[PDB]
Amino acid sequence: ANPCCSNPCQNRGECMSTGFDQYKCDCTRTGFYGENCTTPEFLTRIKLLLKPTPNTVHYILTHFKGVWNIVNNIPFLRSLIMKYVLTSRSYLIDSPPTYNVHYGYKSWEAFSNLSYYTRALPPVADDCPTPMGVKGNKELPDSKEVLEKVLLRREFIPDPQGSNMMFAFFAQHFTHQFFKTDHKRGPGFTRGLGHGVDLNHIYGETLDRQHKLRLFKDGKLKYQVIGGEVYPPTVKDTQVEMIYPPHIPENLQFAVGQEVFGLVPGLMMYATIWLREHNRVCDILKQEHPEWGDEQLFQTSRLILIGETIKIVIEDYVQHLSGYHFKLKFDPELLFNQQFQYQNRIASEFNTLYHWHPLLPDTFNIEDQEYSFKQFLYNNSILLEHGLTQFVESFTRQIAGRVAGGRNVPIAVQAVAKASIDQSREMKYQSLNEYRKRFSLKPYTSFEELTGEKEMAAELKALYSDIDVMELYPALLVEKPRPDAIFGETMVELGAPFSLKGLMGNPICSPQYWKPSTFGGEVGFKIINTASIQSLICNNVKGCPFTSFNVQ
Amino acid sequence: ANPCCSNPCQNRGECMSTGFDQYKCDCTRTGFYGENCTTPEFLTRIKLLLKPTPNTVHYILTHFKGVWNIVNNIPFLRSLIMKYVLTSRSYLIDSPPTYNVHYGYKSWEAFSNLSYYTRALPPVADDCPTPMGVKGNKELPDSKEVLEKVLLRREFIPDPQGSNMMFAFFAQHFTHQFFKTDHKRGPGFTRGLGHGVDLNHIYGETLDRQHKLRLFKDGKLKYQVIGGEVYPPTVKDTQVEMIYPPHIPENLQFAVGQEVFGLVPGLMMYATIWLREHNRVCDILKQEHPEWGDEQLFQTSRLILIGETIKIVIEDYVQHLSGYHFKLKFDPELLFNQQFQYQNRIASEFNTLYHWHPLLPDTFNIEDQEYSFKQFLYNNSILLEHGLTQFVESFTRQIAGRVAGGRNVPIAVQAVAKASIDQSREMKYQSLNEYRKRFSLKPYTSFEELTGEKEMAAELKALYSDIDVMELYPALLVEKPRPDAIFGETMVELGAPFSLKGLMGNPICSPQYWKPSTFGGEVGFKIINTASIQSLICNNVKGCPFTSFNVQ
């Protein structure tokens, strides 16, 4: 019965029920008047008649390599750009946070509760007629279908971008701090109240945990040496909470910031690395400050590491993920005169877009061997067996599956991807065209447009009928990739903002934090400013096995 | 042994232990180089040689009344000013938050833990030699002395500013949401994680509580009618948690957002008002949206009310408290192009400066009667007896005690004010000259300067010896008032920033919030934009008894 059901209000306008069967649009600071926030104002026009399509830009970003090389070696220029990129996004996210699962209108309970996941777009009134408000049928295509009909991988599709296993597990490992949905509660609730890059996966969310993972000496994290190698410590020695299957031997039950991380030798590997990184830093500090305390070292480290991370992600991970020729730079000093809200709340959407299963290979080739999901899972014995070094090298090449192309979802991952759809539905997610419009994206006029190819498209049009009624998550994996890219435009234009927020919006990136002091001074500062997934592995891993998020 | 103990680094510089008996200053974005962040840069100079003393300004603010009347009527002008005032402060606070009780260096644990109270200035290394770092003796003057020697009120001193009881109880009541120190934990910890104006005192901090205080109908708060009047409801009917003394009869045990508020008929009175305000709003909304739900009304109300509050404080309370001739305006639209961090963490300092006991009268004259603390305390029977209307009128006149003059602390309040000193000491608070310097205030060179008068001064100099070693809290109450003002410069220049933060930095003051929609549209929006302690009482209280925070 909700007169807003139809998502009438345009351009970030706000719909309000001005009576049982009537509504109203809050076209405030939107740039458009009219009952629907459509009629634009002048500057609006000129603003749009100077707004280049993302594809256009993306293009320019990935071409003229020669020129990009020029700028890539001209500090002010580079920054001037990187900044532009920074700022280009910025004005997109709703910070401070607004809606969430249960709240379609701004509410204190909303803005306050931290267990919720904020929503870039409001849900749909449970009173609304159709799942997408009004357009569509009493229901949505069964997921199993869609799942199969266009998602599940038939022939493994490699990511044209060269995304190796390293990248995959990173992204996997990394994103696992922010995204941490508490299911006991629901799909919409997170358990990572840190709502951002806080390496809680390395040090636990609660202090209690953190302390058990702490050695309380030189601010180092409790560790353990197996076969002359540094590894996370046992659950039987730290009593830390770790999610493991009955058979696992105590000598194998690893304890780390994240309780789930034991079920994936891929994850565990990274852990071990970072863990090693931390303590590595501790030593460097204890060198600088022979007069510091355990609790100070431990805390300075965590600050420096968080820095590195934010760096290695933006400058490596994200860099590669974009395939731009411009070298992405991480320097907060760029927002020091930019109206930027150094804060962040994690959105449901951003979580879903994450469901990057396609990356997942069909087997896991470590050195000679090749493993199956059925094999890999919870078999850290694997990790122990081959060693970090090999793992690195190995994973540094085993290309990962493309993700936007279509039907490239491992069958083992079956269950998951389905949920990914089922969920968004429960959370009354909005139409993909809505989320498209939201981020100022022209909506897809035909399934064929969304895919390019006519196969799936037609196959989908069968299922959804109205392009509008197309679900986001799905549309994302099926989306029509960019020229050899791994993602479509949609997935990029959504995570780009969402990301550079929690990335930049992190405390340490704020003025009264960005300084040597904050990190034990210059030395420990440099560390962050000179951090690459490369060195991260170089230092922490034996023999400095070369690596990249790119398979050569 | 801490080489930083001596607070060497100047101008917000950061000190770091560069070895056992050596340190270093992080003069970053400070404006000064030199080992101590002293040598200034050019623009710095020109910036200072254009920086008018607060006293100067304060003066200009409280004079030329004729001119102020001119501007007070030319919108752009007024705003242009108010804004200036807004922005003048801003660049002072450390948002996002930095140090706290246990942390003198920036730390995650710090920035993360919300039970802590942030600290505008770092504590002092427990390893430091003297309580104020180095200057001073192995200890500090016994508090009992100071307490008596210069704090306790002998002859009641009225605030020259006319601060009636209304103001007092408001300030009291209002500030009681942010400040809510959890003693079970310690002096440094707050229980109001809301860390700001969130009217948790009206709706409780936890949802559980809130729901019990909710009637779940038209989004109204559960209430009760006694003798034809609207009053908060009983603990025996809501099971809400309320702090009460054994004798109190259930029929008197009031349940309200704040558990402590029952022990002060002054507080309770305000509650009842606000409570009445809320439900009042609910009706106005239910009029606008006959199609809204209990939980939406309830939430919109709380949003509108929070607005009112932020208004009534800034525009009334704060206005009066300043005695400026310029009419202070509350309009977030002023920061919509200002690098302002719409967020807030409550500082310990700000909490202490609050300890405004001097305001407290010696008796409480309600109509004919006159009461004693021993009387008033936990005697809401009083409130019930006379009625809200009288209470208003009465309190609207009973002048409150000045606070900066000196020795004006009620003896009943004895215990408290002492604590106020004892505490800051535990929390290793810094020197008053430090906190002075901090907010770019020339430090007091002599106790006589801090007081003007020679009596107390001399009396103190006996106790502290070095002006520097003068404690803040004390120095505040004894401080030398402004020409007929109720506060000295120190207290003003500290709470000014601290305040306009949590005041402005509140969500609802942010761009994606400041709009009719957010509040059920224009109608419910206007409400906030047209709110005065006056109307607040006018609407909620019978007969619209005139009021002001000024006793005529």
Ligand SMILES: *[C@@H]1O[C@H](CO)[C@@H](O[C@@H]2O[C@H](CO)[C@@H](O)[C@H](O)[C@H]2NC(C)=O)[C@H](O)[C@H]1NC(C)=O
């Ligand atoms: C605002 O948007 C609504 C739709 O969200 C428009 O209303 C529809 O207009 C068509 C064409 O006249 C009618 O056939 C429909 O019955 C209307 N309602 C709906 C729910 O579709 C409306 O015309 C728009 N107004 C403006 C000024 O843009």
Ligand SMILES: *[C@@H]1O[C@H](CO)[C@@H](O[C@@H]2O[C@H](CO)[C@@H](O)[C@H](O)[C@H]2NC(C)=O)[C@H](O)[C@H]1NC(C)=O
């Ligand atoms: C920086 O500040 C320190 C004090 O915080 C200064 O050091 C003192 O200087 C005096 C005068 O030479 C000596 O008598 C003291 O022994 C020094 N130490 C202390 C703890 O007082 C120092 O001179 C300042 N340096 C600069 C460049 O400003």
Ligand SMILES: CCCCCCCCO[C@@H]1O[C@H](CO)[C@@H](O)[C@H](O)[C@H]1O
């Ligand atoms: C001076 C440099 C001018 C660069 C103009 C670039 C215009 C790019 O144009 C883009 O090309 C894409 C193909 O890759 C299409 O998919 C997009 O729809 C189209 O807008």
Ligand SMILES: CCCCCCCCO[C@@H]1O[C@H](CO)[C@@H](O)[C@H](O)[C@H]1O
């Ligand atoms: C064009 C307007 C010029 C105004 C000049 C104002 C100078 C105020 O000067 C101030 O006066 C106070 C007395 O009230 C003193 O206590 C302060 O120390 C003094 O700086």
Ligand SMILES: *[C@@H]1O[C@H](CO)[C@@H](O)[C@H](O)[C@H]1NC(C)=O
């Ligand atoms: C957040 O909301 C959920 C459901 O509304 C509730 O169960 C939970 O206790 C809330 N969290 C907090 C911290 O209030």
Ligand SMILES: *[C@@H]1O[C@H](CO)[C@@H](O)[C@H](O)[C@H]1NC(C)=O
């Ligand atoms: C686990 O790994 C070890 C060593 O690689 C191997 O011997 C064992 O068969 C594996 N078990 C499973 C269930 O994968």
Ligand SMILES: *[C@@H]1O[C@H](CO)[C@@H](O)[C@H](O)[C@H]1NC(C)=O
């Ligand atoms: C905050 O810190 C105190 C002491 O460091 C600790 O007891 C408390 O549990 C912490 N709060 C949280 C939420 O971790």
Ligand SMILES: *[C@@H]1O[C@H](CO)[C@@H](O)[C@H](O)[C@H]1NC(C)=O
């Ligand atoms: C409480 O108030 C009632 C009514 O004003 C009065 O009769 C009674 O004496 C008071 N008791 C105390 C302890 O103040």
